[PDB]
Amino acid sequence: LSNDFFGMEDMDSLRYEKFRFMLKMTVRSNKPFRSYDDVTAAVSQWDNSYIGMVGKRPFYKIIALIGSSHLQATPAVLADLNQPEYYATLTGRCFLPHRLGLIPPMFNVSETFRKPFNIGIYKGTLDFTFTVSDDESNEKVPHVWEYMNPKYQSQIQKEGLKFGLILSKKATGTWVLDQLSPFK
């Protein structure tokens, strides 16, 4: 029931970077996550080690955060309460406001990350496929934050820090990726 556990709804200077993305994210855990901050802790472990495209890493972190908010438990947890699995898929186009400087062009090639996670009470695996590329079309786009599940939109700044994202909203009108943490 959505009341006790996360993801059970289904069961029941400054630059703007314009990009498009696709994500497919699977999380497999030993026990069902009780809350969204348990989920983000697990998901955030995806790049504890990283050999993907250097220039894409910030965008991957961002869409991993966004995508996490959409994770939903599959029936795996009803077959076996001890084999919880969660899935999310999302595609979009948007602006990322950031202070990271010039971003080299990004091409339409996917990268897959398959990694363990261990956050104490919870442990398991992550299987993420991300695609991020420049969006050259003339269609108008939202800010990336508009793709966050509204249920969890209020938790953006705090949960972002788990991903190494230092986000602020001081007099800009929108969340800005001010910097990436050297510690994560």
Numbering used by the authors: 41 to 52, 58 to 229
Paper text:
VSVNJ M forms a globular domain with a central α helix sandwiched on one side by an extensive 5-stranded β sheet and on the other by two α helices and a smaller two-stranded β sheet that is very similar to the thermolysin-resistant core of M (Mth) from VSV serotype Indiana (VSVInd), with 0.9 Å root-mean-squared displacement (rmsd) over 156 Cα atoms. The N-terminal 57 residues of VSVNJ M do not form part of this globular domain. While residues 1–40 and 53–57 are not well ordered and could not be modeled in electron density, residues 41–52 are located in strong electron density bound in a deep hydrophobic pocket formed by the loops between sheet β1 and helix α1, the region between helices α2 and α2.5 (including sheet β2), and the stretch of 3–10 helix immediately preceding helix α3. F46 is central to the interaction: the side chain of F46 sits deep in the hydrophobic pocket lined by the side chains of residues Y81, V84, L116, Y131, Y197 and the backbone between residues 114 and 116. Overall, these interactions bury 1050 Å2 of surface area. The interaction of the globular domain with the N-terminal peptide of an adjacent molecule in the crystal gives rise to non-covalently linked linear polymers of VSVNJ M monomers. Our structure reveals that the Rae-1 binding site on VSV M partially overlaps with the N-terminal self-association motif.
The rhabdovirus matrix (M) protein is small (∼20–25 kDa) but plays a number of roles during the replication cycle of the virus. To further investigate the role of the N terminus and hydrophobic surface-exposed loop and to investigate the structural conservation of M across Rhabdoviridae, we solved the structures of full-length M from VSV serotype New Jersey (VSVNJ) and from the lyssavirus Lagos bat virus (LBV).
